[PDB]
Amino acid sequence: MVKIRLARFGSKHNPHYRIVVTDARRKRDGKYIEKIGYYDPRKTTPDWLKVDVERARYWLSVGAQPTDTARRLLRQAGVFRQE
Amino acid sequence: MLTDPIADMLTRIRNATRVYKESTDVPASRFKEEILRILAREGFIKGYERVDVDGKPYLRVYLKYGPRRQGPDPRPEQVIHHIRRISKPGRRVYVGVKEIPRVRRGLGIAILSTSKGVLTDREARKLGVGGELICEVW
Amino acid sequence: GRYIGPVCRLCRREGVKLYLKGERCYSPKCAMERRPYPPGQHGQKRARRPSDYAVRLREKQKLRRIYGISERQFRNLFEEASKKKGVTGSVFLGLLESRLDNVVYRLGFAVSRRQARQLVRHGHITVNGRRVDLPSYRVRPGDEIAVAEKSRNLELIRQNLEAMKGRKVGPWLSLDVEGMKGKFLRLPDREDLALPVNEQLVIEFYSR
Amino acid sequence: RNLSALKRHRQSLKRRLRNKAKKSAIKTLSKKAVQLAQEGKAEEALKIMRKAESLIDKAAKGSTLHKNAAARRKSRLMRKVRQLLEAAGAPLIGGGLSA
Amino acid sequence: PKKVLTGVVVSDKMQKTVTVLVERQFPHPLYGKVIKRSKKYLAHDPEEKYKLGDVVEIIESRPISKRKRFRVLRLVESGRMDLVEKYLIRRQNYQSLSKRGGKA
Amino acid sequence: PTINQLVRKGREKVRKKSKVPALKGAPFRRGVCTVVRTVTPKKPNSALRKVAKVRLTSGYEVTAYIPGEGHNLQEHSVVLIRGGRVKDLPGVRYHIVRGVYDAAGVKDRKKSRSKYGTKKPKEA
RNA sequence: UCGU
RNA sequence: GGCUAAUCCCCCAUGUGGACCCGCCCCUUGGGGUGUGUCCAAAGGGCUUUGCCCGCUUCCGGAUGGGCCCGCGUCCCAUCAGCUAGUUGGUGGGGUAAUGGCCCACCAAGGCGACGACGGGUAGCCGGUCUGAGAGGAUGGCCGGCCACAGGGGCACUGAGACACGGGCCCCACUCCUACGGGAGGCAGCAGUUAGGAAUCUUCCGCAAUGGGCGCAAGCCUGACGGAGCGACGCCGCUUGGAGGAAGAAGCCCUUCGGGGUGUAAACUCCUGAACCCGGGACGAAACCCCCGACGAGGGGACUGACGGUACCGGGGUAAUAGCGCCGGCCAACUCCGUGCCAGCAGCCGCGGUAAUACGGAGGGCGCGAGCGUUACCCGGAUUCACUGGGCGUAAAGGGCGUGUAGGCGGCCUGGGGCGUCCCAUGUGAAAGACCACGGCUCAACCGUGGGGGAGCGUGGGAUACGCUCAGGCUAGACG
Ligand SMILES: [K+]
Ligand SMILES: [K+]
Ligand SMILES: [K+]
Ligand SMILES: [K+]
Ligand SMILES: [K+]
Ligand SMILES: [K+]
Ligand SMILES: [K+]
Ligand SMILES: [K+]
Ligand SMILES: [K+]
Ligand SMILES: [K+]
Ligand SMILES: [K+]
Ligand SMILES: [K+]
Ligand SMILES: [K+]
Ligand SMILES: [K+]
Ligand SMILES: [K+]
Ligand SMILES: [K+]
Ligand SMILES: [K+]
Ligand SMILES: [Mg+2]
Ligand SMILES: [Mg+2]
Ligand SMILES: [Mg+2]
Ligand SMILES: [Mg+2]
Ligand SMILES: [Mg+2]
Ligand SMILES: [Mg+2]
Ligand SMILES: [Mg+2]
Ligand SMILES: [Mg+2]
Ligand SMILES: [Mg+2]
Ligand SMILES: [Mg+2]
Ligand SMILES: [Mg+2]
Ligand SMILES: [Mg+2]
Ligand SMILES: [Mg+2]
Ligand SMILES: [Mg+2]
Ligand SMILES: [Mg+2]
Ligand SMILES: [Mg+2]
Ligand SMILES: [Mg+2]
Ligand SMILES: [Mg+2]
Ligand SMILES: [Mg+2]
Ligand SMILES: [Mg+2]
Ligand SMILES: [Mg+2]
Ligand SMILES: [Mg+2]
Ligand SMILES: [Mg+2]
Ligand SMILES: [Mg+2]
Ligand SMILES: [Mg+2]
Ligand SMILES: [Mg+2]
Ligand SMILES: [Mg+2]
Ligand SMILES: [Mg+2]
Ligand SMILES: [Mg+2]
Ligand SMILES: [Mg+2]
Ligand SMILES: [Mg+2]
Ligand SMILES: [Mg+2]
Ligand SMILES: [Mg+2]
Ligand SMILES: [Mg+2]
Ligand SMILES: [Mg+2]
Ligand SMILES: [Mg+2]
Ligand SMILES: [Mg+2]
Ligand SMILES: [Mg+2]
Ligand SMILES: [Mg+2]
Ligand SMILES: [Mg+2]
Ligand SMILES: [Mg+2]
Ligand SMILES: [Mg+2]
Ligand SMILES: [Mg+2]
Ligand SMILES: [Mg+2]
Ligand SMILES: [Mg+2]
Ligand SMILES: [Mg+2]
Ligand SMILES: [Mg+2]
Ligand SMILES: [Mg+2]
Ligand SMILES: [Mg+2]
Ligand SMILES: [Mg+2]
Ligand SMILES: [Mg+2]
Ligand SMILES: [Mg+2]
Ligand SMILES: [Mg+2]
Ligand SMILES: [Mg+2]
Ligand SMILES: [Mg+2]
Ligand SMILES: [Mg+2]
Ligand SMILES: [Mg+2]
Ligand SMILES: [Mg+2]
Ligand SMILES: [Mg+2]
Ligand SMILES: [Mg+2]
Ligand SMILES: [Mg+2]
Ligand SMILES: [Mg+2]
Ligand SMILES: [Mg+2]
Ligand SMILES: [Mg+2]
Ligand SMILES: [Mg+2]
Ligand SMILES: [Zn+2]
Numbered sequence A: 001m002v003k004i005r006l007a008r009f010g011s012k013h014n015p016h017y018r019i020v021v022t023d024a025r026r027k028r029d030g031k032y033i034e035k036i037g038y039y040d041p042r043k044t045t046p047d048w049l050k051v052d053v054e055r056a057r058y059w060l061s062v063g064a065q066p067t068d069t070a071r072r073l074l075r076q077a078g079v080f081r082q083e
Numbered sequence B: 001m002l003t004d005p006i007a008d009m010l011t012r013i014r015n016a017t018r019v020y021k022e023s024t025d026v027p028a029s030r031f032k033e034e035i036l037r038i039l040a041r042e043g044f045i046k047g048y049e050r051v052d053v054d055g056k057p058y059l060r061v062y063l064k065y066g067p068r069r070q071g072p073d074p075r076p077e078q079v080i081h082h083i084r085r086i087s088k089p090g091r092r093v094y095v096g097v098k099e100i101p102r103v104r105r106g107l108g109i110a111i112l113s114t115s116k117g118v119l120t121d122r123e124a125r126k127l128g129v130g131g132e133l134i135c136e137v138w
Numbered sequence C: 001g002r003y004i005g006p007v008c009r010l011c012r013r014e015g016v017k018l019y020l021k022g023e024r025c026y027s028p029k030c031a032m033e034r035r036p037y038p039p040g041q042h043g044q045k046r047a048r049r050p051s052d053y054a055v056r057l058r059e060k061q062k063l064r065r066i067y068g069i070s071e072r073q074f075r076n077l078f079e080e081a082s083k084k085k086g087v088t089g090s091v092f093l094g095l096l097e098s099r100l101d102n103v104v105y106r107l108g109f110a111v112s113r114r115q116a117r118q119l120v121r122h123g124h125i126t127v128n129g130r131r132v133d134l135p136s137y138r139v140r141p142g143d144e145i146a147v148a149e150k151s152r153n154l155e156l157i158r159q160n161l162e163a164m165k166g167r168k169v170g171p172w173l174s175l176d177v178e179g180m181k182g183k184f185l186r187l188p189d190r191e192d193l194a195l196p197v198n199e200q201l202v203i204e205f206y207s208r
Numbered sequence D: 001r002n003l004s005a006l007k008r009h010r011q012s013l014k015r016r017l018r019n020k021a022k023k024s025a026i027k028t029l030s031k032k033a034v035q036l037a038q039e040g041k042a043e044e045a046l047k048i049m050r051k052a053e054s055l056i057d058k059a060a061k062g063s064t065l066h067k068n069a070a071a072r073r074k075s076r077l078m079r080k081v082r083q084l085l086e087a088a089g090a091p092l093i094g095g096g097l098s099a
Numbered sequence E: 001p002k003k004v005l006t007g008v009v010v011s012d013k014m015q016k017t018v019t020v021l022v023e024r025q026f027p028h029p030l031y032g033k034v035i036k037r038s039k040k041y042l043a044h045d046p047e048e049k050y051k052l053g054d055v056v057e058i059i060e061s062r063p064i065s066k067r068k069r070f071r072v073l074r075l076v077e078s079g080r081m082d083l084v085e086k087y088l089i090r091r092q093n094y095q096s097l098s099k100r101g102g103k104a
Numbered sequence F: 001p002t003i004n005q006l007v008r009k010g011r012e013k014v015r016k017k018s019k020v021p022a023l024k025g026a027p028f029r030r031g032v033c034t035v036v037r038t039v040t041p042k043k044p045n046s047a048l049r050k051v052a053k054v055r056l057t058s059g060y061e062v063t064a065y066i067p068g069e070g071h072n073l074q075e076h077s078v079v080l081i082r083g084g085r086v087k088d089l090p091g092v093r094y095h096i097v098r099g100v101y102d103a104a105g106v107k108d109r110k111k112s113r114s115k116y117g118t119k120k121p122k123e124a
Numbered sequence G: 001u002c003g004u
Numbered sequence H: 001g002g003c004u005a006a007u008c009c010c011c012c013a014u015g016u017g018g019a020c021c022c023g024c025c026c027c028u029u030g031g032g033g034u035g036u037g038u039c040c041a042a043a044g045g046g047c048u049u050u051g052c053c054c055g056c057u058u059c060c061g062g063a064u065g066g067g068c069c070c071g072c073g074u075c076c077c078a079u080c081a082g083c084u085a086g087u088u089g090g091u092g093g094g095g096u097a098a099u100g101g102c103c104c105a106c107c108a109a110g111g112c113g114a115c116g117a118c119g120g121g122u123a124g125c126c127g128g129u130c131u132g133a134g135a136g137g138a139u140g141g142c143c144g145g146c147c148a149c150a151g152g153g154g155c156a157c158u159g160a161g162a163c164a165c166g167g168g169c170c171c172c173a174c175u176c177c178u179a180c181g182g183g184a185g186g187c188a189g190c191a192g193u194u195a196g197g198a199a200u201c202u203u204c205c206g207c208a209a210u211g212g213g214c215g216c217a218a219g220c221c222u223g224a225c226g227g228a229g230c231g232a233c234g235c236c237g238c239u240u241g242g243a244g245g246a247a248g249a250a251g252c253c254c255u256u257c258g259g260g261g262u263g264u265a266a267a268c269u270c271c272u273g274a275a276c277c278c279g280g281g282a283c284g285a286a287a288c289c290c291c292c293g294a295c296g297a298g299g300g301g302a303c304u305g306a307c308g309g310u311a312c313c314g315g316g317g318u319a320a321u322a323g324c325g326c327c328g329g330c331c332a333a334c335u336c337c338g339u340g341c342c343a344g345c346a347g348c349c350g351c352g353g354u355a356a357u358a359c360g361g362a363g364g365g366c367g368c369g370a371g372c373g374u375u376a377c378c379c380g381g382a383u384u385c386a387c388u389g390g391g392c393g394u395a396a397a398g399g400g401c402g403u404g405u406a407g408g409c410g411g412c413c414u415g416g417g418g419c420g421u422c423c424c425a426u427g428u429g430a431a432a433g434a435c436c437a438c439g440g441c442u443c444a445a446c447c448g449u450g451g452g453g454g455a456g457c458g459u460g461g462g463a464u465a466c467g468c469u470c471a472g473g474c475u476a477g478a479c480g
Helices: A053-061 A068-076 B005-018 B030-041 B121-126 C010-014 C052-066 C071-083 C088-096 C100-106 C113-121 C155-162 C199-205 D007-038 D042-059 D069-084 E081-094 F003-008
Strands: A002-008 A017-023 A034-039 A049-051 B045-053 B056-063 B109-114 B117-120 B131-137 C125-127 C144-147 C173-176 C181-184 E004-014 E017-028 E032-044 E055-065 E068-077 F029-033 F053-056 F061-065 F078-081
Touching (some): A002 A053, A002 A068, A017 A068, A034 A053, A049 A068, B005 B030, B005 B056, B030 B045, B030 B109, B030 B117, B109 B121, C071 C088, C088 C199, C100 C125, C100 C144, D007 D042, D007 D069, D042 D069, E004 E032, E004 E068, E004 E081, E017 E055, E032 E055, E032 F003, F053 F078, F061 F078
Antiparallel strands (some): A002 A017, A017 A034, A034 A049, B109 B117, B109 B131, E004 E017, E004 E055, E017 E032, E055 E068, F029 F053, F053 F061
C-alpha cells in the first residue's frame, strides 16, 4: 500500500531524511508522491525535525501506512496527539 | 506592383535623405501614414502631408537634417541616421512585450504594430503589448 | 604545497617590494636595496619592452605572490568574485583580505603572512573562541580573531604582540593588544588597501 | 540449486487443471444452449442457458474468469439465445431472460 | 479536452469513412517565417453524411479502427473543391518526379 | 539563400574527419613491428628518420615514428602508438611511445624526460 | 643539379 | 496402488448487494436510475475464550499503481522515389480488464508519399551535462524518471499483476554428467575468474540505521542498503616549515678576468611542532516490545552500533616528500659547450649544411605544484553552413536560354470572422541540478532548509494594427 517513510538525502556519515509519502514498491530514495517533512538524526541544528501535520493527517486519512520510525517521528510532532 | 510598400517607404526616405532632398513623395496608405505619425511625433522628420500626384494619392514626407558643418564635406548630419525593415513578407517578425527591443539604448526607436495600433517601442511597452516589429530607426 | 622557496627574489623579479618576511624587508637588507633587479644571470642586462600579456601576467603574479596563495586557490577566489555582485576588482581584493591567515597578519599577531600561516596551522589562533587551523578560513565581519590562551605565553607571540603596543591597525580591523584579541570590523574597501597592484590588469589577465 | 519456490510451479499445474476444466464445461454448455435455441427448442435451450449462466459466475467466484470476463460471456450467451429463439421461439421456461 | 480539428474532405471512397485534410500554420523553430504544414485524418462517418469540399470539425474519439481515431463532429461549410482540387493536383504532381513523369 | 530556401534546405552541419584512424578512437593503440626502416625527410630537410610498420590490434598496418636519440626496436617488437603526425614524412601520422613494452626509453635523457619515458637519474 |  | 487435515475443492441456503438479457427514464460513445426474469457469497484461527484479536464474503467509494488512445516534438543519406493485400475501410464474430485488422469470416477497393512515404545507416529517450555573450553546438557516465532486455528465437501457464533475470515448455548454439537410452545448465545481482582492450576495484564488514518481504508478535530473510578496501580518476582542504643570518662548492658551471650568477639560498645559531603500537572517546538510536492507560491519545520501560577504538577532545612531541613541462615567434623565461642538412626537434610558421637563445647537455630563468605533461574526443575562438550572423563581375559560387507545374511572395479603400500575432487569469512545468539566501561538518569540497525565475502545452477571458480568410469597392500593377 502507499506509505509514509524516510528517504535518504544527506551524505556519507551526514544523513538527512525526508519524511515522504510514496508507493511501498518504489526505491526508497526513488520518486515519491509528496514530501511532508524532514529529519536530521543527529540534530545538527535546532530545526532537526519538521512535519506538515495537516498533510500527514491527510495521507493517514486515505490509507497511508507509516514506517515504525516514520510513525515515531510523526507522533513526536503531535500527528496523533489528540489530547 | 511593389512587393512590400512599408519597405518601399522606409527606403524612399532613406534614399531622399542621402542626397538631402527637401521632401519625398510615397504612395499613400492608411498604414504608411500611421508610421509617418510616429516618425513626425518622434521628430525624425519635419512632418508629412497628403497630396495628389498625377491624380493619385501620395504622402509628401518632409525631411529634416542637422546644421551645415566644418572642414571639408559641410554636409549636415542626418536626423534619420538609420532606418531598416525588420518584419518582412516572407519572414514576419512578431514579439511579446517582454521581447520588444531597446533600440540604441533608448536613443533610437522601434515601431511595432499592435492590436492597440502602431506604437513606438516605449508606447507599446507602456500599454504592455507586443506585435509585429515593423522597423528600427535612429 | 604553498610554494616554499627563496622569497626576497620574487620581489626582485616583480620590480616592486613584496613584504614576505615582514621584518628585514625593512632593514638595509631586503636586497631591494642592493639588487632591485630581477634574479638570474640576466637580471642586470638591458630590459626588453614587455608584452601586453607580460604586463598583465606579472601584475597577477605580484598580487598573488603577496598573499602567498596557490594559483589554484587564487583563481578560485577571482572566479567567485566575478560571480558576486559588485566591482570584481575590489570584491576580489576583499575576499583575499578575508583569509584568516591574512587577517592574523593584519592584526600583527605575526610578522609575515607566511609566519601567520604557520600560526594558524599550528592552532595558535582562535576565531570566536574556537580553534581554526585553516589558513584559508574566511573571516566574516564581527568575528573576533585571537590567540589561544595556551599560546599566549609563547615567546614569539610575546615579542610580536608587544611590538604592536601603541601601533596602528587597518581601519576595517581593531585589536585589543593586552587581551590579544582582534575584530574583523568589515570588508576593506579598495581605498583601505594600498597595494602595488592595478587589479584591473588582473581582471584582464583572466579574460584572455 | 534447489529453490524450494518451484512449489509454485508445482501448484500452478494443479490450478491450470482446475481452470481448464471449468472452462470446458462453460464452453460446452453454452454451445449446447445456443444449439438448442437455434433449433427452436426453447424450454430446454433456456434450461441449459441457465446452467451455463451459473457455471460462468462461479468460474468468476475464484480466479478462473473473474473480472468482467464473466459478464461478457453471460452477455453474449443471453444475446445469442434470445435472438436465435426468433424462429417462433416464445420463451417457454422464461429461464434467465427477463422478457 | 478531446482534440477538435478542422479540415476538408478529400476522400469519400470509403464505407463510413472520410479523409479529412487538416492544415496548421506556425513560425519555423529556427527561421521564423510562418510555414504551413498539414496532415490527413481518417474520420468516422456512420451515415455517409459528408462529401468532398465539405469543411468539417474532427473530434478526438475512441478508436474506431486501426488508423482511425476521430469522428466528424460537424460541417462548417459545404462544397468547395478549391481545396480538394489543390490537394489533388499536388498529388497528381507526384505523378512525375521519378523515372518517367507527366508534363504539367 | 532566401529564408524560404533556408526553410527548404537549411544549413549543412559540416562533419569532422579524424587524423588518427587509430580506430576505437582510443588514446593509444597497441601493435607489433614489421619493417623498421629509415626514411628521407621531404620538402627542405635531410636526415635518416627512424620509422616503423606496425600491425595494430585495431587490425591496422601503419608506419609510426620512433622519436628519441636512439632505439632498440626490432621486428617483433610490441609497441604502443600514441598518434601524432611527423610534419616531414608524409604518410607518418602516429608516434611510438618510448617507455612502453618493448620500446625502451631514451637513456642518458636529462630534460624532457616524461616524454621518451626515462626514469629520473639518481643524482647524488 | 639541389637547399641558402 | 492405499490412507488423510485444513483458511484446499465442490454442492445447497441466505442476497445487504452485484452480474446478464429485455423494457422505461435521465444522461449522452459502454455514464446513471428503475422494474421483471435469471445467475453469484464466505474460513477459519488465537487467546488476558464468553468478548476481544488476526482473518473470511459481497457491494459502493478512497488512495496508490497501471493499460490503451490522441496533438505537437525527436539523427544521417534522395547516389533510397515510389510504397502497401490484413494492405485501407466495412459488417459480423473471436479475444481482452478494455478500444482497435489485435485476430478471423465475408464484402468494398481502398491507404501512404516530395510537408520525404518505402529503403539504407546510426542510436534507448528525458531531467540534465559540457561549451558558448547569446542563438547554438555537443552529449545523455554517475543520480532521478520512462522504455527495453535477461545465451539467441518462439510460446503460454499461474496469478490483482508476468508471457516472468535467480518459474515452466520447444527449437538453436555452447559447457557439463552419461552405463550412449538420456539428463543438467545460463553472474546484463554482489564479489571474483578468464578473454578482449590503452583501461576500470575487494571472492571485504554489517543488518546497527533507512527501505522492502512474511508474521498477531518475538522475529526471520534482505550482496537493496549502510560502511570499510583498492586507484591522485575528480573536486575541496592540508604538509614538506616560521623568524634571523650573503663561503662561495676538485667539479657543475658566466666573464670584458674588474667581476657577474645560483642568493638569504644553504645537513651551520633561535621558534613552532605533520608525523608518532602514548589518556579519554561519539552523534548517528529510539522505536517495534513490555507495563499503566482503553492493544487509542498520552506516559514510563529492558534491548540493539558494522562503521570503530574511527572521528573529536586533552597530553606529550620530531624540522619532517618535490616534482613535471617549458624558455625562436604565437607565448612568461637566455647564456656556455657539444653536434655540423648529421644526431635530431617540430602544434602552425619552421630549426640543424661550423658563432644554433629552436638539436643534446649544463648553469640560469618562466609556469604550475602532489602534481605536471602527452594522446584521444567535445564546445570555443570559426560571422569558417552566417536564425542571431556570410556570400556568388575578376577570389569558390548565376542554372546555356526560355516556358511554365507545385510552392514561396502580393496594390489601394471598407466590412465580417479572429487562424497567425498580442495581452490577462489559471492549470502544468516532480525530485535532483543550476541561481540567491541562511545554515551543518574547524573551512572547503559535500550537505541541509528556504526563496526566485521559467519557455512549451491545456483552459477561460480579451484586442484586431499587421499577416490570413470571406464579402464588397477602386484603378496607380497586369492584361486588352
Ligand atoms: K504514383
Ligand atoms: K431482480
Ligand atoms: K476499490
Ligand atoms: K484510479
Ligand atoms: K491513466
Ligand atoms: K469489427
Ligand atoms: K550553462
Ligand atoms: K538537449
Ligand atoms: K540526444
Ligand atoms: K504487517
Ligand atoms: K593531539
Ligand atoms: K629542514
Ligand atoms: K665546434
Ligand atoms: K639552447
Ligand atoms: K573546434
Ligand atoms: K558555368
Ligand atoms: K545543363
Ligand atoms: Mg531579425
Ligand atoms: Mg563581480
Ligand atoms: Mg511457500
Ligand atoms: Mg466438449
Ligand atoms: Mg462513402
Ligand atoms: Mg633543413
Ligand atoms: Mg597532435
Ligand atoms: Mg624539447
Ligand atoms: Mg636543404
Ligand atoms: Mg491414488
Ligand atoms: Mg476458498
Ligand atoms: Mg435490494
Ligand atoms: Mg447460492
Ligand atoms: Mg473464534
Ligand atoms: Mg469488434
Ligand atoms: Mg468487445
Ligand atoms: Mg491477464
Ligand atoms: Mg494488422
Ligand atoms: Mg545500440
Ligand atoms: Mg559562437
Ligand atoms: Mg553559461
Ligand atoms: Mg540514470
Ligand atoms: Mg552473456
Ligand atoms: Mg529469450
Ligand atoms: Mg489468469
Ligand atoms: Mg521470475
Ligand atoms: Mg518481459
Ligand atoms: Mg542470474
Ligand atoms: Mg559480477
Ligand atoms: Mg590483455
Ligand atoms: Mg536492516
Ligand atoms: Mg526493517
Ligand atoms: Mg589538492
Ligand atoms: Mg657562492
Ligand atoms: Mg628561512
Ligand atoms: Mg622544542
Ligand atoms: Mg540519543
Ligand atoms: Mg491494559
Ligand atoms: Mg509511547
Ligand atoms: Mg530490532
Ligand atoms: Mg604542545
Ligand atoms: Mg618571451
Ligand atoms: Mg651524430
Ligand atoms: Mg655552437
Ligand atoms: Mg637546448
Ligand atoms: Mg558557428
Ligand atoms: Mg543570414
Ligand atoms: Mg564568405
Ligand atoms: Mg580563374
Ligand atoms: Mg570564378
Ligand atoms: Mg547567364
Ligand atoms: Mg502559381
Ligand atoms: Mg495584401
Ligand atoms: Mg495567397
Ligand atoms: Mg479583414
Ligand atoms: Mg486567434
Ligand atoms: Mg505558464
Ligand atoms: Mg525542478
Ligand atoms: Mg559554515
Ligand atoms: Mg558552507
Ligand atoms: Mg534546494
Ligand atoms: Mg487561450
Ligand atoms: Mg473586431
Ligand atoms: Mg476586421
Ligand atoms: Mg476584392
Ligand atoms: Zn622582500
